[PDB]
Structure formats: structure tokens, C-alpha cells
Point group: D3
């Protein structure tokens, strides 16, 4: 298995990211995915976006403080105001052996909505939007 | 908590948190991921109570966010345990908001809900059997399920 | 002893809340009380409030990282611009035995002042203020 | 530090801190609780110096906040040890501000002060006797009291 | 990454970070010190990979910051190992930005770069010999230097 | 060796300041220096300043969580929009013996630039600027 999508965030898991027990917890990973996914969404949407939905998720492997956490992003659909982005979470191991090993922690599809200043949906511009063109072209394969 | 449609919060209050500047995305908006984080953290308090020790998250079901939250709003996570297996515990978390930043001030609404699946683990991250003898938190959870 | 007031904040004591030694310290508790008390004050005041005063306080029991910390709020007086709120701090134990036990850590009365945009005192509105009515009605017993 | 009324800071500088965005309440205001936190943290530096180890807070006296603080202002906590008992230490903390955000820029004023009571404890949180033999920090504190 | 002058990023991506509200100075600006912090943290990931354990920073060379960064912009640190000695490792860190907050949106530029010197240390902070037998990270680093 | 300059920041090294390994790292110290140096720069500049440059630096001693960290500031030159500030970093030991000992960790010269609202350089006002006068007078000795 190889990563799919563009790299969105590459983040060290820090002590301030853990729960009270010192474990990197699922919520922190969900939060990285949402934040990272939205970078790509905003790029395509040319402005403010919000998360309207996320698909179910399974966490297959643990993450330790010190480990490097990568979020990868793949736009699957662009609607009028909505954008579906698939986010994969990959870890490069630092804290314990085998050091340097890369593994997939989870993935999920997020749906974002392009919004105006008042929080209402807006049409993603289609004219002179090369971020949208790049995304559609990638979908037209996959 | 009770909304315009007459829905009421279900379960026990896990967390009651103010949405703060340091919780927003870079644009200053309260974002899905922060809510997701609060749900997991809050759900796991209940799961750890029942499990009698360390728990990890293995699954979360799909979620929709129906209404935005502003900085300054009060954000509440309520939990109900829906299933306890050998080492697994399913907790449904509802997120309720009490409006502070914008009118109508004081309005309550439900932003989202979702079932989290947690697993009781030891120190090595290996699954462990939830203790069923003399577990008052579990008995209370199971009585709640027979009733709900 | 039972809690008195409405629940204002329910917060996990986190590693990022400790002093440099890893102890939950009195300052953090004072800070929660002030923040939590002010929620109720703002409700009644219908806008911006600041803390003008806090009564003396004693810390009777320690709090451990992992423990759940609850602030409870009881409005004792509403003046023209000032509001006195009694805050109690209760802990539900997670970190050590007995697990699940609830105890009172401290309590104190905070005085808040309703302020305008420039930091000057303003009259708390008395007309169509059901938060004020609820508070006054509770005082008329308690 | 010296204000318009001619008051001057008393004691030793414990902390010198910028009021930051992440220190505000949700409205963006620097709030009482953050100042209270800084006082306790800063006072305890002096208390730990004298006590020769771990200290906890047992009491704080009443406090008034006379003037607001803006984000960007410099906030200083000064401490004077007023009493050392067997295991207890009383530290008076004054909070001084140097104005940055708003005019008059550079003005200094005292926001609040209060006496904190700390107790020297061991690892189990049990009170311990402050060492009185060969304690230069204590000797300095006591000489300051006879004079301050 | 590729700018208007045709410069391209050199090395491996160490960190890819959003500039957040909580990273600014009190005025809300992204400041030199935060960038400096990210460079050191990111450079040390590569240094620790090669060194096979703990590393500390002993030196940083001079730096200029050519262009400001806004909150919301994506900030990337790229690293190239330039020298490995007995216990020392020199990593050049370039900071690249992808514009988000302001036009032109999506533009990439290099804010700064600088060489950090790290030292491989044990648990007591004492320098240790970087292992040269069976060190694939070191072999890769050295092959990159002979080429680049 | 004695400290030189005015005290700019006096900060406890906290757990949330460490890298993922729990070490106070050079980046955090650089960040304190830049922040602290800029206080003095803003004072003299009478408004917004940014960092355009920093000199090379060497870190001679380690800092432990719990230790007190002081940044000291000495303005070396005022140009039209630029200000050179020398920052020294001193530690008073708390975490390990000898407790109370003070040592110098590093020093470096930072160059700040006075900027307007749009990020462009502006002339530091020379009229009715007693912060500038104090700095120039200190330079005239150093
Ligand atoms: C997102 C939001 C504006 C959509 O409201 P709305 O009344 O349905 O707006 P619209 O009818 O214009 O729908 C906008 C788009 O979202 C899509 N959508 C709505 N609900 C959806 C859901 N549950 N799942 C997937 N797509 C959804 C619509 O089909 C539409 O798509 P399109 O424009 O590509 O055709 C509103 O639900 C909201 O503000 N939610 C909170 C968002 C938020 O702040 N999240 C952060 C965490 S709280
Ligand atoms: C928790 C973990 C040890 C379970 O792994 P495992 O090999 O499947 O162990 P088990 O097969 O015994 O499963 C334990 C329980 O979880 C349940 N479970 C496992 N995978 C599940 C899934 N994806 N969805 C729902 N339930 C699941 C099992 O049915 C089992 O239930 P039971 O004991 O009540 O009958 C493992 O998946 C893990 O360590 N994941 C990382 C968790 C984590 O750190 N998450 C947060 C950040 S990544
Ligand atoms: C709060 C503040 C506006 C009051 O200033 P002021 O000149 O006394 O204003 P007023 O005379 O209008 O007094 C306002 C109310 O506060 C009350 N008050 C003033 N000082 C008080 C004190 N020490 N204790 C209790 N109440 C007090 C007054 O009696 C009056 O009450 P009322 O309107 O119900 O009759 C001013 O002291 C201030 O801005 N302080 C700093 C507040 C702050 O920012 N705190 C956060 C931590 S720094
Ligand atoms: C510190 C603590 C062990 C002291 O408890 P204790 O049973 O009263 O122990 P002692 O009776 O020996 O009191 C120790 C000293 O504190 C003083 N003291 C106790 N309570 C006090 C009070 N409420 N106000 C002022 N001084 C007080 C005593 O007079 C005694 O003084 P001395 O040794 O100088 O003569 C205890 O109260 C505690 O652990 N509280 C929690 C502290 C804490 O964690 N606070 C921060 C967050 S909750
Ligand atoms: C600082 C900045 C405005 C200067 O741009 P500029 O086009 O050179 O502006 P100027 O020509 O007016 O130069 C302004 C001053 O800086 C000085 N300066 C410029 N580059 C310098 C450098 N590398 N080292 C020292 N001084 C420098 C100039 O000599 C001039 O000094 P003076 O007014 O006292 O005579 C621009 O480089 C910038 O915005 N950089 C990013 C700053 C930033 O945001 N840093 C935070 C971390 S990213
Ligand atoms: C790392 C440290 C142990 C090295 O100290 P030392 O007594 O000089 O040890 P050494 O003489 O063996 O030097 C180790 C290596 O660093 C190099 N080095 C030392 N000082 C240097 C300097 N100031 N500039 C560039 N390289 C330097 C040496 O040349 C040597 O290289 P080599 O092993 O590849 O041949 C020490 O300086 C230290 O603990 N400093 C604190 C580091 C720290 O905590 N920084 C972050 C926050 S303060
Ligand atoms: Ca290896
Ligand atoms: Ca809180
Ligand atoms: Ca109302
Ligand atoms: Ca029990
Ligand atoms: Ca600071
Ligand atoms: Ca002036
Ligand atoms: Ca991040
Ligand atoms: Ca564009
Ligand atoms: Ca000593």
C-alpha cells in the first residue's frame, strides 16, 4: 500500500496533543484530517469552507508522541457548493522500533461546503479556477 | 437542553466547554475536527468509567454537522453507553450548544451526534476483558440499556 | 454536602494545565472559577462583563491530571452593573482511588461588572431579561 | 515601576509576561482568572526557593482588579515573603502593567495584589518542615521582613 | 515549490504546518521566532533520523526574512544534511510558504533558510558518536552530499 | 559575567515548551529572544515592528523544564526604520543542582524594522520619543 493524494499536513505528535493519560487519541487524528482536508477544499473552493459531513472511520494502528503524522488529500467530487475529499493518515515511526517505518492509521471521506460570510452555501467559481481544473482532471482518471 | 423541534439531550453530561479562540481554524471558525475531538475525549470518560481503566478509540460512525458554532458558545457532549462486549464499549455522543455569541442568545440546539467504539486495553495497547464482577459503573450502564 | 448552583464548566484536568512540576496548581482552579462564573454573569448581564473582585479562598483537596473538574455557579446579588456569583469547584476522581468519588475543592464569591465597549460600567437591562428573573427568583428563596 | 499616585512596586520580579491572544477569554479580553493564575505561578517560584522543594497553594486572600489589561501589554508579578512558619510561607504578589496596546503607551500601573499562602509538601502531598539550617534563601527572606 | 525567480525547494519536506492564530505575536503577526522554532524542530527530525537518537541544537547561522507570512498560510520546512562529523550534524533548512490569506493565492516563495548544527547526545546531554555501521539514514545522507 | 541590557521577559520553561522528547530546544529559546527583543524595538519604534534578520548564535548550556529564563535587551543602533537589538538569555536554575545558580545560555543581535499597516518600512519618529532618546543615550556610552 502506497499513499494516495497530495500531502496536506506533516505534523509531529506532541505531548500537548495527548489525552490526560498521555496517549495520542482518535479525536486528535480526526481533527488533523478535518483541518488538512479543508486546505485542499479551500484551494478548490476559492474561499471559506465548512465541514458538513464525515464518513465512518476505523483506527487500525496507534500513534506515539514523537511520531510524524501525514495527512494526504484526494478530491473525489466537486458539486455546486460541496467538495468531497478523501483523507489518509500515515505515520512515520520515531518513538519505538522499527524506527523509520511508515504505516496507514485510517482514512475517511469528508464533505466540505463553500460558504459565504454569513455561513450560507455559495457556488464554487468555475471560471479561472485552475485548482478546480487540476482536481477534475485527477478525478477523470481515478 | 431542549430545541425548537422539541428534541432533548440524551445521556449524561461528559464535557461542558466554551468554544475558545485557540480552538478555531486559521480563519477563526469553530471547525468539525475540534467538535470531533471533544466527542472522542468526552465519550472516552464514560468508556473508561465502565471499562475500569485505559481505553482507545477503534471506530467512529458517520456524522453530519447541521449548524455552525461561534467562539464563546457553550458546547456540551452527552454520552449513552449502547453496548458493552468483552473488551469493546459503544458510546453515543450528542453535541449540544447553548448560544452566546449571536442571537438568539441562550438558544439550545444539537450540532451532531455519533457512536464511538472504544476498546479496553492494557499498557501495551492489547485488548483486555472489561471486569464484570463488582462493576457498579457497568451495572448502571446495562440497567440504562434495558430501559432507554 | 451536595453541589449548589448550576453547572457552568465540566473540564478534564490536562497535562497542559499543570505547573512545571506537573501539579494542578491553585491558579488554574482560580482561572476556571473566574471563567465559569462569568458565563452565568454574562447570561444575566446580557453582554460583556469583567471581574472587579474575588473573595478569599482555601484549597482543601488536591486535583490530579485526568480528574474531572466541575464549576458550579449561584448568583447571590444583582446590583445596577454588578453581579455577585458564588462558584464551587467539585472533582470527580479518575487518576487514583477511590475512582468515581466526588469532592469539593474550594468555593468563592466573584463580583462581575457589566461593561460597555469602552470598559465602562453599564446598567444591566431589567426589561425582557428572563435570565435576571430566574436569578432573582432563586435568590428570593436562598 | 512607579505610578501617577507615586506608588512603586514592592518585592522581587517573579514573572514578566506579555498578555497574549491565547490568554484571553472568548471575547478577547484579558480576564481576572488569567491574572490570578500568573500570581499563583509567580508567587510559588519565590515560595519554592525558600521552601527548598515542592510547594502547594492552600489559601489566597481577597483581591480587587482596579484597571483592565489589553493584549500586548507587559504584565509583571512582584513577590515579597511576609511570613515563614513550619511548613507554610506567605507571599504577597503585586501585579504591575506596562501599557503597550493603548495610550498612554509606557504608563505603569498596579492592577491588583494579594497574599498567597503556600505549604511545603513532600511527594505524597503531605506537609514538610522547611529547612532552617543552611537556607540562604530563607535567611534573605527573614532579613527582608526585619527591614521592609 | 517554485518561485517567480525560478528557485525550487531543496531537500526533504520535514514539516508542513498551517500558520495559526496561536502562533502569532500579540499584534496578530506571524513573527521571526515562530519560524525559527519550526526550522529547529523540523531540522532536528532529519538530524535524529541520521544520528539514531537524541540530538540537541548547538549553533544556528545568521538568517534574513525576506517576506511576511499571514495566518492561514501553509509553511513548509525542507532539510538537507550538509555534513556529518563524529557527533555533529549540519542541516540546512529552507522555509517555503504557500499563500492562503492574501492574493496572489497559491503563490509559493522562500521566506528564509539557515544551517543548523545539531549534536548527538546521550541521556545526560553528553556528546555521543553517531553510529556509522549499518546506518541507512547516514548512507543516504552521505550519498546525497556526494551528488547535490 | 553579568547580564547586559534591560530585562524584557522572565519566563518559566514549561512542559508545553519542550520538543516531543521533553527537552527545551533551541527553537524555543530563539523564539523567546525574538519576542522579547521586539518589545524593546516596539517601544523605540512607536508601533508595529518585524524581524528582518538575526545574527548567528551558539547554545552553550541546556535549560530544564522548571528553570527560569530571562531575556535581556540592549539596543545597539537605530537607523531610519531599522533597530538592532542585542538579546542575552540567562537561566536561573530550579530543576537540578546547583539550585539558584545563574548562567548565560546564548546571545544574538536581532534587526527589527518599523512597519506600517501594510507591512512597508516607516520612519521611526524622532520627535517626542523619549524611548529613542533613552536608547541613543545608552549607545553614546557603550
Ligand atoms: C453546511 C450548511 C451551510 C449546509 O446547509 P444547507 O441548508 O443544506 O445548504 P444547501 O442546501 O445549500 O446545501 C449545500 C451543499 O451541501 C450539500 N449537503 C447538505 N447536507 C449534506 C450532508 N449531510 N452530506 C453531504 N452533503 C450535504 C448539499 O447537497 C449541497 O451540495 P451542492 O451545492 O454541491 O449541490 C449547513 O448545514 C451548516 O452551516 N452546517 C454547519 C457547518 C459547520 O459549521 N461545520 C463545522 C463544525 S460545527
Ligand atoms: C484496540 C485494538 C488493540 C483492537 O485490535 P484487535 O486486533 O482487533 O483486537 P480484537 O480483535 O480483540 O478487538 C477488540 C474489540 O474491538 C472490536 N473491534 C475491532 N475492530 C473494530 C472495528 N473496526 N469496528 C468496530 N469494532 C471493532 C472487536 O469486535 C472486539 O470486540 P469485543 O472484545 O467486544 O468482542 C487495535 O485495533 C488498536 O490498538 N488500534 C489503535 C487504536 C488507537 O490507538 N486509536 C486512536 C488513535 S490511532
Ligand atoms: C470594574 C470597573 C469598570 C469599575 O469601575 P468604577 O469606576 O468603580 O465603576 P462604577 O463606579 O460604575 O462601579 C460599577 C459597579 O461595581 C461596583 N464595584 C466597584 N468596585 C468594587 C469592588 N471593589 N468590589 C465589589 N464591587 C465593586 C460598584 O459598587 C458598582 O456596582 P453597581 O453598579 O451594582 O452599583 C473598573 O474597576 C475596572 O475596569 N476594573 C478592571 C476590570 C478588569 O478588567 N478585570 C479583569 C482582570 S484585570
Ligand atoms: C497543603 C495541605 C497538605 C495542608 O493540609 P493540612 O492538613 O492543614 O496540614 P497542616 O495542618 O500541617 O497545615 C500546614 C500549614 O498550612 C497552614 N494552613 C492550613 N490551612 C490553611 C488555611 N486554610 N489558610 C491559611 N493557612 C493554612 C497551617 O497553619 C500550617 O502552617 P505551619 O506549618 O506553618 O504551622 C492540604 O491542605 C492540601 O494538600 N491541600 C491541597 C493543596 C492544593 O493542591 N492546592 C492547589 C490546587 S487544589
Ligand atoms: C522588513 C522588510 C519590510 C524590509 O523590506 P525592504 O524592501 O528592504 O524595505 P527597506 O528598503 O525600506 O529597508 C528597511 C530597513 O531595513 C534594512 N534592512 C533590509 N534588509 C536588511 C537585512 N537583511 N539586514 C539588516 N537590515 C536590513 C534597510 O537597510 C532599512 O534600514 P533603515 O530604514 O534603518 O535605513 C521586508 O524585508 C519584509 O517584510 N520582510 C519580512 C519581515 C517579517 O515579516 N518577518 C517576520 C518573520 S517571517
Ligand atoms: C552539545 C554539547 C554537549 C556539546 O558540547 P561540547 O563540550 O562542545 O562537546 P564537543 O566538544 O565534543 O562538541 C560536539 C560537536 O559539536 C561541535 N560544536 C561544538 N560547539 C560548536 C559550535 N558552537 N558551533 C558549531 N559546532 C560546534 C564540535 O565541533 C563537535 O563536533 P564533532 O563531534 O562532529 O567533531 C553542549 O554544547 C551543550 O549541551 N549545549 C546545550 C545544547 C542545548 O541544549 N541547546 C538547546 C537549548 S540551550
Ligand atoms: Ca534503524
Ligand atoms: Ca476551559
Ligand atoms: Ca435575550
Ligand atoms: Ca471502582
Ligand atoms: Ca512568553
Ligand atoms: Ca509615547
Ligand atoms: Ca497542526
Ligand atoms: Ca486564484
Ligand atoms: Ca541550595
Amino acid at each position: 500500500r502506497q499513499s494516495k493524494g497530495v500531502l496536506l499536513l506533516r505534523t509531529l505528535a506532541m505531548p500537548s496533543d495527548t489525552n490526560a493519560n498521555g496517549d495520542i487519541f482518535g479525536g486528535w487524528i480526526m481533527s488533523q484530517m478535518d483541518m488538512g482536508g479543508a486546505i485542499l477544499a479551500k484551494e478548490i473552493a476559492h474561499g471559506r469552507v465548512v465541514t458538513v459531513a464525515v464518513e465512518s472511520m476505523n483506527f487500525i494502528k496507534p500513534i506515539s508522541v514523537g511520531d510524524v503524522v501525514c495527512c494526504y488529500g484526494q478530491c473525489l467530487k466537486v458539486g455546486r457548493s460541496s467538495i468531497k475529499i478523501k483523507v489518509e493518515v500515515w505515520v512515520k515511526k520515531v518513538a519505538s522500533e522499527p524506527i523509520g517505518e511508515r504505516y496507514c492509521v485510517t482514512d475517511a471521506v469528508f464533505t466540505f461546503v463553500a460558504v459565504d460570510n454569513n455561513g450560507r452555501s455559495r457556488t464554487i467559481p468555475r471560471e479561472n479556477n485552475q485548482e478546480l481544473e487540476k482536481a477534475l482532471a485527477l478525478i477523470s482518471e481515478q
